[PDB]
């Protein structure tokens, strides 16, 4: 995962 | 310019931006939870004197995925246009590039699209 | 970070950028002729603490194509990475979006790539 | 594979495709009106043995914008994945390239995205 | 059409294609080593009646990354144009999409560019 | 206009 | 033409 | 790695 898409 | 304020993508990420008189964009991109750990700086530019023919207003911005908590060694640009009206939106395509070795350059850049609205998904 | 300075693409366009300690990119994009009429503001971000494993340094920037002389109602983002060494380069893909009416949205965004070097083409 | 059949994008363009056992895609892309003048050949490939972990099925296709009525000197590729279920979709990004002179190469390729569904918009 | 034959990208991958009178592209994409294990089917389309004004010839093709040896659950489209002359080339941008779960859709599609020539790198 | 988007 | 590519 | 780029 990547911070552009983390909840 | 109707750009200044809080925008939400369809995954519920958010950014807050100030559109400057001069064409500057500055603000912050965050995960929908909005904690410090998931906030990142955002800088860009926009057309501060758009057409008045019903065209959108062109813009773009960048986020480097490094803050005080995390470094994903990567950066995303969003390129798109702002469309005003009762249901304002910012329609965008993005490029996420990670730092790679020259061998791994092939997998360096992801592509996708985002629609931002003034109201959450 | 080796990023600060003058870069040339293979068409001979140039930008000059200052990489800030903080991760800020600021400068100017110009046509190879370099006259005022073809200079535009550039702002972006970069990874200010890249990996030391031989990976590139991720960055991106935006130019809104409006200055005191011209307004092309459009804006380009470059997304890529800086690769150091005796032959430093910045490898990029770009998205050029123009403001359009909703009918003309299909033709709003061009895509392409640029390699920037420290020496002219 | 659930791919064979008629698909509609959100603008109401349609394509009909046959997925072959072998991984072949063949069919026709049309404007929503569907007259002969707006039908074009479509050929591509898909993953004929996708993962069973709930992943989509990767595919792509090309249309050259020439038929017996019209030649737009251009061609579009859609790259994406098929996602099955009660609300099947094909999620895509596309590249439309026109033939240009070397001067005009900069404006040769548009980028965008399409979601295809089994039911019209 | 000058398209039929063997093309090499700058990484030394190769494809062999037959351009049909009708606008069909068919052939094979391989790693530079060229062993069976790294050969994949390629199908696409091209403009079979290009402009004669010195414009390139628009084309595209797809490879699904499945053969009898390997399944990478993915597919790449190349969109571009053929440019004839003593130094013929095919200038391309590509989209590589992998099958993903809906969570992992963000990382589904890589983007990049390839220049193919008649002679190896 | 372009046939990818014509009605 | 476009200023990204003008000489 | 990926077969688009393997040697």
CSV table of C-alpha atoms in Angstrom, one decimal:
chain,number,residue,atom,x,y,z
A,1,UNK,CA,0.0,0.0,0.0
A,2,UNK,CA,0.8,3.6,-0.5
A,3,UNK,CA,-0.3,6.8,1.3
A,4,UNK,CA,-2.1,8.2,-1.9
A,5,UNK,CA,-4.7,5.4,-1.2
A,6,UNK,CA,-4.4,4.5,2.6
A,7,UNK,CA,-7.6,5.1,4.6
B,1,UNK,CA,-11.6,31.1,-8.6
B,2,UNK,CA,-13.9,28.5,-6.9
B,3,UNK,CA,-10.8,26.3,-6.5
B,4,UNK,CA,-9.9,27.4,-2.9
B,5,UNK,CA,-11.2,24.9,-0.3
B,6,UNK,CA,-11.6,21.2,0.4
B,7,UNK,CA,-11.9,18.6,-2.2
B,8,UNK,CA,-12.7,14.9,-1.9
B,9,UNK,CA,-11.9,12.1,-4.3
B,10,UNK,CA,-14.1,9.0,-4.8
B,11,UNK,CA,-11.9,7.0,-2.4
B,12,UNK,CA,-12.4,9.7,0.2
B,13,UNK,CA,-8.9,11.2,0.2
B,14,UNK,CA,-9.0,14.9,0.7
B,15,UNK,CA,-6.9,17.9,-0.2
B,16,UNK,CA,-7.2,21.5,0.9
B,17,UNK,CA,-5.8,24.1,-1.4
B,18,UNK,CA,-5.5,27.8,-1.5
B,19,UNK,CA,-5.6,29.3,-5.1
B,20,UNK,CA,-3.5,32.4,-5.1
B,21,UNK,CA,-4.4,35.5,-7.1
B,22,UNK,CA,-1.2,34.9,-9.0
B,23,UNK,CA,-1.9,31.4,-10.2
B,24,UNK,CA,-0.2,29.6,-7.1
B,25,UNK,CA,-1.8,26.4,-5.6
B,26,UNK,CA,-0.6,25.5,-2.1
B,27,UNK,CA,-2.1,23.1,0.6
B,28,UNK,CA,-2.2,19.7,1.9
B,29,UNK,CA,-3.2,16.2,0.7
B,30,UNK,CA,-4.5,13.8,3.3
B,31,UNK,CA,-6.1,10.3,3.8
B,32,UNK,CA,-9.8,10.5,4.7
B,33,UNK,CA,-8.9,9.8,8.4
B,34,UNK,CA,-6.9,13.1,8.2
B,35,UNK,CA,-4.3,12.3,11.0
B,36,UNK,CA,-0.9,14.1,10.9
B,37,UNK,CA,0.8,10.9,9.8
B,38,UNK,CA,-1.2,10.9,6.5
B,39,UNK,CA,-0.9,14.6,5.6
B,40,UNK,CA,1.5,15.7,2.9
B,41,UNK,CA,2.5,19.1,1.3
B,42,UNK,CA,0.9,19.9,-2.1
B,43,UNK,CA,2.1,22.7,-4.5
B,44,UNK,CA,0.9,23.5,-8.0
B,45,UNK,CA,-0.3,26.0,-10.5
B,46,UNK,CA,-3.6,27.0,-12.1
B,47,UNK,CA,-4.8,29.3,-15.0
B,48,UNK,CA,-5.8,32.4,-13.0
B,49,UNK,CA,-7.6,34.0,-16.0
B,50,UNK,CA,-9.6,31.1,-17.6
B,51,UNK,CA,-11.8,31.4,-20.7
B,52,UNK,CA,-15.4,32.5,-20.0
B,53,UNK,CA,-16.9,30.4,-22.8
B,54,UNK,CA,-17.9,27.7,-20.3
B,55,UNK,CA,-14.4,26.0,-20.5
B,56,UNK,CA,-12.9,24.5,-17.3
B,57,UNK,CA,-9.9,26.0,-15.6
B,58,UNK,CA,-6.6,24.0,-16.2
B,59,UNK,CA,-4.4,23.2,-13.1
B,60,UNK,CA,-2.0,20.7,-11.7
B,61,UNK,CA,-0.2,19.9,-8.5
B,62,UNK,CA,2.4,17.6,-7.0
B,63,UNK,CA,2.7,15.7,-3.7
B,64,UNK,CA,6.1,14.1,-2.8
B,65,UNK,CA,5.1,11.2,-0.5
B,66,UNK,CA,7.5,12.3,2.4
B,67,UNK,CA,6.3,13.9,5.7
B,68,UNK,CA,7.8,13.7,9.3
B,69,UNK,CA,6.4,10.2,9.6
B,70,UNK,CA,6.9,8.4,6.4
B,71,UNK,CA,8.8,8.4,3.1
B,72,UNK,CA,7.3,6.3,0.3
B,73,UNK,CA,10.2,7.5,-2.1
B,74,UNK,CA,7.6,8.6,-4.6
B,75,UNK,CA,5.6,11.6,-6.0
B,76,UNK,CA,2.3,12.0,-7.7
B,77,UNK,CA,1.2,14.8,-10.1
B,78,UNK,CA,-2.4,15.5,-10.8
B,79,UNK,CA,-3.1,17.2,-14.2
B,80,UNK,CA,-6.7,18.3,-14.9
B,81,UNK,CA,-9.3,21.1,-14.9
B,82,UNK,CA,-11.7,22.7,-12.5
B,83,UNK,CA,-15.4,22.8,-13.7
B,84,UNK,CA,-17.6,25.2,-11.7
B,85,UNK,CA,-21.4,25.2,-11.2
B,86,UNK,CA,-23.8,23.8,-8.6
B,87,UNK,CA,-21.9,20.5,-8.9
B,88,UNK,CA,-18.3,21.7,-9.1
B,89,UNK,CA,-15.6,19.2,-9.8
B,90,UNK,CA,-11.9,18.8,-10.5
B,91,UNK,CA,-11.4,16.1,-13.2
B,92,UNK,CA,-7.8,14.7,-13.1
B,93,UNK,CA,-5.4,12.2,-14.4
B,94,UNK,CA,-2.4,11.4,-12.3
B,95,UNK,CA,1.1,10.0,-12.6
B,96,UNK,CA,2.7,8.3,-9.5
B,97,UNK,CA,6.5,7.8,-10.0
B,98,UNK,CA,8.7,6.0,-7.4
B,99,UNK,CA,12.4,6.3,-7.2
B,100,UNK,CA,13.9,3.1,-8.7
B,101,UNK,CA,17.2,1.6,-9.8
B,102,UNK,CA,17.7,1.8,-13.6
B,103,UNK,CA,16.8,-1.9,-13.8
B,104,UNK,CA,13.4,-1.2,-12.2
B,105,UNK,CA,12.6,1.9,-14.2
B,106,UNK,CA,9.9,-0.1,-16.1
B,107,UNK,CA,7.8,-0.2,-13.0
B,108,UNK,CA,8.5,3.3,-11.9
B,109,UNK,CA,5.3,5.1,-12.9
B,110,UNK,CA,1.6,4.3,-12.3
B,111,UNK,CA,-1.2,6.1,-14.0
B,112,UNK,CA,-4.8,6.6,-13.0
B,113,UNK,CA,-7.6,9.2,-12.7
B,114,UNK,CA,-9.4,11.1,-9.9
B,115,UNK,CA,-12.6,13.1,-9.8
B,116,UNK,CA,-12.7,15.5,-6.9
B,117,UNK,CA,-16.0,17.0,-5.5
B,118,UNK,CA,-16.9,19.5,-2.8
B,119,UNK,CA,-18.9,16.8,-1.0
B,120,UNK,CA,-17.6,13.4,0.3
B,121,UNK,CA,-18.2,10.1,-1.6
C,1,UNK,CA,20.3,17.1,-3.9
C,2,UNK,CA,21.9,17.6,-7.5
C,3,UNK,CA,18.5,18.8,-8.7
C,4,UNK,CA,19.1,22.5,-8.3
C,5,UNK,CA,20.2,24.2,-11.6
C,6,UNK,CA,19.4,24.2,-15.3
C,7,UNK,CA,18.0,21.3,-17.2
C,8,UNK,CA,17.4,20.9,-20.9
C,9,UNK,CA,15.0,18.5,-22.6
C,10,UNK,CA,15.7,16.9,-26.0
C,11,UNK,CA,13.7,19.6,-27.8
C,12,UNK,CA,15.9,22.2,-26.1
C,13,UNK,CA,13.3,23.7,-23.7
C,14,UNK,CA,14.9,24.5,-20.4
C,15,UNK,CA,13.9,24.9,-16.8
C,16,UNK,CA,15.8,26.3,-13.9
C,17,UNK,CA,14.8,25.0,-10.5
C,18,UNK,CA,15.8,25.5,-6.9
C,19,UNK,CA,15.3,22.3,-4.7
C,20,UNK,CA,14.6,23.5,-1.2
C,21,UNK,CA,15.9,21.7,1.9
C,22,UNK,CA,12.3,21.0,2.8
C,23,UNK,CA,11.3,19.3,-0.5
C,24,UNK,CA,10.1,22.4,-2.4
C,25,UNK,CA,10.8,22.9,-6.1
C,26,UNK,CA,10.5,26.4,-7.5
C,27,UNK,CA,11.7,28.0,-10.7
C,28,UNK,CA,11.0,28.8,-14.3
C,29,UNK,CA,10.3,26.8,-17.5
C,30,UNK,CA,11.3,28.4,-20.8
C,31,UNK,CA,11.6,27.9,-24.6
C,32,UNK,CA,15.2,27.4,-25.7
C,33,UNK,CA,15.3,31.0,-27.0
C,34,UNK,CA,14.6,32.1,-23.3
C,35,UNK,CA,12.9,35.4,-23.9
C,36,UNK,CA,10.5,36.8,-21.3
C,37,UNK,CA,7.5,35.9,-23.5
C,38,UNK,CA,8.2,32.2,-23.2
C,39,UNK,CA,9.0,32.0,-19.5
C,40,UNK,CA,6.5,30.5,-17.1
C,41,UNK,CA,6.4,29.8,-13.3
C,42,UNK,CA,7.1,26.2,-12.2
C,43,UNK,CA,6.4,24.8,-8.7
C,44,UNK,CA,6.6,21.2,-7.5
C,45,UNK,CA,7.9,18.8,-4.9
C,46,UNK,CA,10.7,16.2,-4.5
C,47,UNK,CA,11.8,13.5,-2.1
C,48,UNK,CA,14.3,15.3,0.0
C,49,UNK,CA,15.6,12.1,1.7
C,50,UNK,CA,15.9,9.6,-1.1
C,51,UNK,CA,17.1,6.0,-0.7
C,52,UNK,CA,20.8,5.5,-0.9
C,53,UNK,CA,20.6,2.1,-2.7
C,54,UNK,CA,21.2,3.6,-6.1
C,55,UNK,CA,17.5,4.5,-6.6
C,56,UNK,CA,16.5,7.8,-8.3
C,57,UNK,CA,14.9,10.7,-6.4
C,58,UNK,CA,11.1,11.0,-7.2
C,59,UNK,CA,9.8,14.5,-8.1
C,60,UNK,CA,7.2,16.4,-10.0
C,61,UNK,CA,6.2,19.9,-11.0
C,62,UNK,CA,3.5,21.9,-12.7
C,63,UNK,CA,3.5,24.8,-15.1
C,64,UNK,CA,0.3,26.7,-15.9
C,65,UNK,CA,0.7,28.1,-19.4
C,66,UNK,CA,-0.1,31.7,-18.4
C,67,UNK,CA,2.4,34.6,-18.0
C,68,UNK,CA,2.1,38.3,-18.7
C,69,UNK,CA,2.2,37.7,-22.5
C,70,UNK,CA,0.2,34.7,-23.2
C,71,UNK,CA,-2.5,32.4,-21.8
C,72,UNK,CA,-2.8,28.9,-23.4
C,73,UNK,CA,-5.5,27.9,-20.9
C,74,UNK,CA,-3.7,24.8,-20.1
C,75,UNK,CA,-1.2,23.2,-17.6
C,76,UNK,CA,1.4,20.5,-17.7
C,77,UNK,CA,2.6,18.3,-14.9
C,78,UNK,CA,5.9,16.4,-15.2
C,79,UNK,CA,6.2,13.2,-13.0
C,80,UNK,CA,9.5,11.4,-12.8
C,81,UNK,CA,12.8,10.8,-11.0
C,82,UNK,CA,16.2,12.4,-10.8
C,83,UNK,CA,19.2,10.0,-11.5
C,84,UNK,CA,22.6,11.4,-10.4
C,85,UNK,CA,26.1,10.5,-11.6
C,86,UNK,CA,28.5,11.8,-14.2
C,87,UNK,CA,25.5,11.8,-16.7
C,88,UNK,CA,22.7,13.1,-14.4
C,89,UNK,CA,19.2,13.1,-15.8
C,90,UNK,CA,15.6,13.7,-14.9
C,91,UNK,CA,13.4,11.0,-16.6
C,92,UNK,CA,9.8,12.2,-16.9
C,93,UNK,CA,6.3,11.6,-18.1
C,94,UNK,CA,4.0,14.5,-18.6
C,95,UNK,CA,0.3,15.3,-18.8
C,96,UNK,CA,-0.8,18.5,-20.6
C,97,UNK,CA,-4.5,19.3,-19.8
C,98,UNK,CA,-6.3,22.2,-21.5
C,99,UNK,CA,-9.5,23.8,-20.2
C,100,UNK,CA,-12.4,22.5,-22.3
C,101,UNK,CA,-16.2,22.5,-22.4
C,102,UNK,CA,-17.6,19.2,-21.2
C,103,UNK,CA,-18.2,18.2,-24.9
C,104,UNK,CA,-14.5,18.6,-25.6
C,105,UNK,CA,-13.3,16.9,-22.4
C,106,UNK,CA,-12.2,13.9,-24.6
C,107,UNK,CA,-9.4,16.0,-26.1
C,108,UNK,CA,-8.5,17.7,-22.9
C,109,UNK,CA,-5.2,15.9,-22.0
C,110,UNK,CA,-2.1,15.0,-24.0
C,111,UNK,CA,0.5,12.6,-22.7
C,112,UNK,CA,4.2,12.4,-23.5
C,113,UNK,CA,7.7,11.9,-22.0
C,114,UNK,CA,10.8,14.1,-21.5
C,115,UNK,CA,14.4,13.4,-20.5
C,116,UNK,CA,16.2,16.3,-19.1
C,117,UNK,CA,20.0,16.6,-19.0
C,118,UNK,CA,22.5,19.1,-17.6
C,119,UNK,CA,23.8,19.7,-21.2
C,120,UNK,CA,21.9,20.9,-24.2
C,121,UNK,CA,20.7,18.5,-27.0
D,1,UNK,CA,-14.9,-15.6,-19.5
D,2,UNK,CA,-17.8,-13.2,-19.0
D,3,UNK,CA,-16.1,-10.8,-21.4
D,4,UNK,CA,-17.9,-11.9,-24.6
D,5,UNK,CA,-20.8,-9.6,-25.4
D,6,UNK,CA,-21.8,-6.0,-25.6
D,7,UNK,CA,-20.3,-3.3,-23.5
D,8,UNK,CA,-21.2,0.4,-23.1
D,9,UNK,CA,-19.1,3.2,-21.9
D,10,UNK,CA,-20.4,6.2,-19.9
D,11,UNK,CA,-20.7,8.3,-23.1
D,12,UNK,CA,-22.8,5.5,-24.6
D,13,UNK,CA,-20.3,4.2,-27.2
D,14,UNK,CA,-20.5,0.5,-27.5
D,15,UNK,CA,-18.3,-2.4,-28.5
D,16,UNK,CA,-19.2,-6.0,-29.1
D,17,UNK,CA,-16.4,-8.5,-28.5
D,18,UNK,CA,-15.8,-12.2,-28.8
D,19,UNK,CA,-13.3,-13.6,-26.3
D,20,UNK,CA,-11.7,-16.6,-27.8
D,21,UNK,CA,-10.6,-19.7,-25.8
D,22,UNK,CA,-7.1,-18.9,-26.8
D,23,UNK,CA,-7.0,-15.4,-25.4
D,24,UNK,CA,-8.1,-13.6,-28.7
D,25,UNK,CA,-10.4,-10.5,-28.6
D,26,UNK,CA,-12.2,-9.6,-31.8
D,27,UNK,CA,-15.2,-7.4,-32.6
D,28,UNK,CA,-16.5,-4.0,-33.3
D,29,UNK,CA,-16.5,-0.5,-31.7
D,30,UNK,CA,-19.4,1.8,-32.5
D,31,UNK,CA,-21.0,5.1,-31.7
D,32,UNK,CA,-24.2,4.7,-29.7
D,33,UNK,CA,-26.3,5.4,-32.8
D,34,UNK,CA,-24.6,2.2,-34.2
D,35,UNK,CA,-24.8,3.1,-37.9
D,36,UNK,CA,-22.3,1.5,-40.3
D,37,UNK,CA,-20.5,4.8,-40.7
D,38,UNK,CA,-19.5,4.8,-37.0
D,39,UNK,CA,-18.4,1.1,-36.7
D,40,UNK,CA,-14.8,0.1,-36.6
D,41,UNK,CA,-12.8,-3.1,-36.2
D,42,UNK,CA,-11.4,-4.0,-32.8
D,43,UNK,CA,-8.8,-6.6,-32.0
D,44,UNK,CA,-7.0,-7.4,-28.8
D,45,UNK,CA,-5.9,-10.0,-26.2
D,46,UNK,CA,-6.9,-11.0,-22.8
D,47,UNK,CA,-5.7,-13.3,-19.9
D,48,UNK,CA,-7.6,-16.5,-20.6
D,49,UNK,CA,-6.5,-18.1,-17.3
D,50,UNK,CA,-7.0,-15.3,-14.7
D,51,UNK,CA,-6.3,-15.7,-11.0
D,52,UNK,CA,-9.2,-17.0,-8.9
D,53,UNK,CA,-8.3,-14.9,-5.9
D,54,UNK,CA,-10.9,-12.3,-6.8
D,55,UNK,CA,-8.5,-10.4,-9.1
D,56,UNK,CA,-9.8,-8.9,-12.4
D,57,UNK,CA,-8.9,-10.3,-15.8
D,58,UNK,CA,-6.3,-8.2,-17.7
D,59,UNK,CA,-7.0,-7.2,-21.4
D,60,UNK,CA,-6.5,-4.7,-24.0
D,61,UNK,CA,-7.6,-3.8,-27.5
D,62,UNK,CA,-7.0,-1.5,-30.4
D,63,UNK,CA,-9.2,0.3,-32.9
D,64,UNK,CA,-7.6,2.1,-35.9
D,65,UNK,CA,-10.1,4.9,-36.8
D,66,UNK,CA,-10.5,3.9,-40.5
D,67,UNK,CA,-13.6,2.1,-42.0
D,68,UNK,CA,-15.1,2.3,-45.5
D,69,UNK,CA,-16.6,5.8,-44.7
D,70,UNK,CA,-13.9,7.7,-42.7
D,71,UNK,CA,-10.3,7.8,-41.9
D,72,UNK,CA,-9.4,9.9,-38.8
D,73,UNK,CA,-5.6,8.9,-39.2
D,74,UNK,CA,-5.5,7.7,-35.6
D,75,UNK,CA,-5.8,4.7,-33.3
D,76,UNK,CA,-6.8,4.1,-29.7
D,77,UNK,CA,-5.7,1.3,-27.4
D,78,UNK,CA,-7.7,0.5,-24.2
D,79,UNK,CA,-5.7,-1.2,-21.4
D,80,UNK,CA,-7.5,-2.5,-18.4
D,81,UNK,CA,-9.2,-5.4,-16.6
D,82,UNK,CA,-12.5,-7.1,-16.5
D,83,UNK,CA,-14.2,-7.4,-13.1
D,84,UNK,CA,-17.1,-10.0,-12.9
D,85,UNK,CA,-20.1,-10.2,-10.5
D,86,UNK,CA,-23.7,-9.0,-10.6
D,87,UNK,CA,-22.3,-5.6,-11.7
D,88,UNK,CA,-19.6,-6.6,-14.2
D,89,UNK,CA,-17.4,-3.9,-15.5
D,90,UNK,CA,-14.3,-3.4,-17.7
D,91,UNK,CA,-12.1,-0.6,-16.1
D,92,UNK,CA,-9.8,1.0,-18.7
D,93,UNK,CA,-7.3,3.7,-19.6
D,94,UNK,CA,-6.8,4.6,-23.2
D,95,UNK,CA,-4.2,6.2,-25.5
D,96,UNK,CA,-5.4,7.9,-28.7
D,97,UNK,CA,-2.5,8.6,-31.1
D,98,UNK,CA,-2.9,10.5,-34.4
D,99,UNK,CA,-0.4,10.4,-37.2
D,100,UNK,CA,1.5,13.6,-37.2
D,101,UNK,CA,4.5,15.3,-38.7
D,102,UNK,CA,7.6,15.3,-36.5
D,103,UNK,CA,6.9,18.9,-35.6
D,104,UNK,CA,3.4,18.0,-34.3
D,105,UNK,CA,4.5,14.9,-32.4
D,106,UNK,CA,3.9,16.8,-29.1
D,107,UNK,CA,0.2,16.7,-29.7
D,108,UNK,CA,0.1,13.2,-31.1
D,109,UNK,CA,-1.4,11.3,-28.1
D,110,UNK,CA,-4.4,11.9,-25.9
D,111,UNK,CA,-5.0,10.0,-22.7
D,112,UNK,CA,-8.2,9.3,-20.9
D,113,UNK,CA,-10.2,6.5,-19.1
D,114,UNK,CA,-13.4,4.5,-19.8
D,115,UNK,CA,-15.6,2.3,-17.6
D,116,UNK,CA,-17.6,-0.2,-19.6
D,117,UNK,CA,-20.8,-1.8,-18.2
D,118,UNK,CA,-23.2,-4.4,-19.5
D,119,UNK,CA,-26.1,-1.8,-19.3
D,120,UNK,CA,-26.3,1.6,-21.0
D,121,UNK,CA,-25.5,4.8,-19.2
E,1,UNK,CA,3.2,-0.2,-45.4
E,2,UNK,CA,6.9,-0.5,-44.1
E,3,UNK,CA,5.5,-1.8,-40.8
E,4,UNK,CA,5.8,-5.5,-41.6
E,5,UNK,CA,9.0,-7.0,-40.1
E,6,UNK,CA,11.1,-7.0,-37.0
E,7,UNK,CA,11.3,-4.2,-34.6
E,8,UNK,CA,13.6,-3.7,-31.6
E,9,UNK,CA,13.0,-1.4,-28.6
E,10,UNK,CA,15.9,0.3,-26.8
E,11,UNK,CA,15.9,-2.5,-24.2
E,12,UNK,CA,16.4,-5.0,-27.0
E,13,UNK,CA,12.9,-6.6,-26.8
E,14,UNK,CA,11.7,-7.5,-30.3
E,15,UNK,CA,8.4,-8.0,-32.0
E,16,UNK,CA,7.7,-9.3,-35.4
E,17,UNK,CA,4.5,-8.1,-37.1
E,18,UNK,CA,2.6,-8.7,-40.3
E,19,UNK,CA,0.6,-5.6,-41.4
E,20,UNK,CA,-2.4,-6.9,-43.4
E,21,UNK,CA,-3.8,-5.1,-46.4
E,22,UNK,CA,-7.0,-4.6,-44.4
E,23,UNK,CA,-5.4,-2.8,-41.4
E,24,UNK,CA,-4.7,-6.0,-39.3
E,25,UNK,CA,-1.5,-6.3,-37.2
E,26,UNK,CA,-0.6,-9.8,-36.1
E,27,UNK,CA,2.7,-11.3,-34.7
E,28,UNK,CA,4.8,-12.0,-31.7
E,29,UNK,CA,6.5,-10.1,-29.0
E,30,UNK,CA,9.7,-11.6,-27.5
E,31,UNK,CA,12.5,-10.9,-25.0
E,32,UNK,CA,15.8,-10.2,-26.9
E,33,UNK,CA,17.0,-13.8,-26.1
E,34,UNK,CA,14.0,-15.0,-28.2
E,35,UNK,CA,13.4,-18.4,-26.5
E,36,UNK,CA,9.9,-19.9,-26.7
E,37,UNK,CA,9.4,-19.2,-23.0
E,38,UNK,CA,9.5,-15.4,-23.6
E,39,UNK,CA,7.3,-15.2,-26.8
E,40,UNK,CA,3.8,-13.9,-26.7
E,41,UNK,CA,1.0,-13.3,-29.2
E,42,UNK,CA,0.5,-9.7,-30.4
E,43,UNK,CA,-2.6,-8.4,-32.2
E,44,UNK,CA,-3.5,-4.9,-33.2
E,45,UNK,CA,-4.6,-2.4,-35.9
E,46,UNK,CA,-3.1,0.2,-38.0
E,47,UNK,CA,-4.2,3.0,-40.5
E,48,UNK,CA,-3.9,1.2,-43.8
E,49,UNK,CA,-4.4,4.5,-45.8
E,50,UNK,CA,-2.3,7.1,-44.0
E,51,UNK,CA,-1.9,10.7,-45.1
E,52,UNK,CA,0.8,11.4,-47.6
E,53,UNK,CA,1.7,14.9,-46.1
E,54,UNK,CA,4.7,13.4,-44.3
E,55,UNK,CA,2.5,12.4,-41.2
E,56,UNK,CA,3.2,9.1,-39.4
E,57,UNK,CA,1.0,6.1,-39.7
E,58,UNK,CA,-1.1,5.5,-36.4
E,59,UNK,CA,-1.2,2.0,-34.9
E,60,UNK,CA,-1.6,0.1,-31.7
E,61,UNK,CA,-1.3,-3.5,-30.4
E,62,UNK,CA,-1.9,-5.6,-27.4
E,63,UNK,CA,0.0,-8.4,-25.7
E,64,UNK,CA,-1.6,-10.5,-22.9
E,65,UNK,CA,1.3,-11.8,-20.8
E,66,UNK,CA,0.2,-15.4,-21.0
E,67,UNK,CA,1.9,-18.2,-23.1
E,68,UNK,CA,2.3,-21.9,-22.5
E,69,UNK,CA,5.1,-21.3,-20.0
E,70,UNK,CA,4.0,-18.3,-17.9
E,71,UNK,CA,1.1,-16.2,-16.9
E,72,UNK,CA,1.9,-12.7,-15.5
E,73,UNK,CA,-1.9,-11.9,-15.3
E,74,UNK,CA,-1.4,-8.7,-17.1
E,75,UNK,CA,-1.6,-7.1,-20.6
E,76,UNK,CA,0.2,-4.2,-22.3
E,77,UNK,CA,-1.1,-2.0,-25.1
E,78,UNK,CA,1.3,0.1,-27.2
E,79,UNK,CA,-0.3,3.2,-28.9
E,80,UNK,CA,1.8,5.2,-31.4
E,81,UNK,CA,2.8,5.9,-35.0
E,82,UNK,CA,5.1,4.5,-37.6
E,83,UNK,CA,7.5,7.0,-39.2
E,84,UNK,CA,9.1,5.9,-42.5
E,85,UNK,CA,12.4,7.0,-44.1
E,86,UNK,CA,16.0,5.8,-44.0
E,87,UNK,CA,15.7,5.7,-40.2
E,88,UNK,CA,12.2,4.2,-39.8
E,89,UNK,CA,10.8,4.1,-36.3
E,90,UNK,CA,7.7,3.3,-34.3
E,91,UNK,CA,7.2,5.9,-31.5
E,92,UNK,CA,4.9,4.5,-28.7
E,93,UNK,CA,3.4,5.0,-25.3
E,94,UNK,CA,2.3,2.0,-23.4
E,95,UNK,CA,-0.1,1.0,-20.7
E,96,UNK,CA,0.6,-2.2,-18.7
E,97,UNK,CA,-2.4,-3.3,-16.6
E,98,UNK,CA,-2.4,-6.2,-14.1
E,99,UNK,CA,-5.4,-8.0,-12.8
E,100,UNK,CA,-6.0,-6.8,-9.3
E,101,UNK,CA,-8.5,-7.0,-6.4
E,102,UNK,CA,-10.5,-3.8,-6.1
E,103,UNK,CA,-8.4,-2.7,-3.2
E,104,UNK,CA,-5.3,-3.0,-5.4
E,105,UNK,CA,-6.8,-1.2,-8.4
E,106,UNK,CA,-4.6,1.9,-7.6
E,107,UNK,CA,-1.5,0.0,-8.6
E,108,UNK,CA,-3.0,-1.8,-11.6
E,109,UNK,CA,-1.6,0.2,-14.5
E,110,UNK,CA,2.0,1.3,-15.3
E,111,UNK,CA,2.8,3.7,-18.0
E,112,UNK,CA,5.9,4.2,-20.1
E,113,UNK,CA,7.1,4.8,-23.7
E,114,UNK,CA,9.1,2.7,-26.3
E,115,UNK,CA,10.9,3.7,-29.5
E,116,UNK,CA,11.2,0.7,-31.9
E,117,UNK,CA,13.8,0.7,-34.7
E,118,UNK,CA,14.7,-1.7,-37.5
E,119,UNK,CA,18.2,-2.2,-36.0
E,120,UNK,CA,19.1,-3.4,-32.5
E,121,UNK,CA,20.1,-1.0,-29.7
F,1,UNK,CA,-14.6,15.8,-33.2
F,2,UNK,CA,-13.4,12.3,-33.5
F,3,UNK,CA,-15.3,9.0,-34.0
F,4,UNK,CA,-14.2,7.6,-30.6
F,5,UNK,CA,-16.7,10.2,-29.1
F,6,UNK,CA,-19.2,11.1,-31.9
F,7,UNK,CA,-22.9,10.3,-31.0
G,1,UNK,CA,1.4,25.2,-31.4
G,2,UNK,CA,1.8,25.5,-27.7
G,3,UNK,CA,4.4,27.2,-25.4
G,4,UNK,CA,5.6,23.8,-24.0
G,5,UNK,CA,7.1,23.2,-27.5
G,6,UNK,CA,7.7,26.6,-29.2
G,7,UNK,CA,11.3,27.4,-30.0
H,1,UNK,CA,10.2,-8.6,-12.9
H,2,UNK,CA,7.9,-8.9,-15.8
H,3,UNK,CA,8.2,-10.5,-19.3
H,4,UNK,CA,7.8,-7.1,-21.0
H,5,UNK,CA,11.3,-6.4,-19.7
H,6,UNK,CA,13.1,-9.7,-19.0
H,7,UNK,CA,16.3,-10.3,-21.0
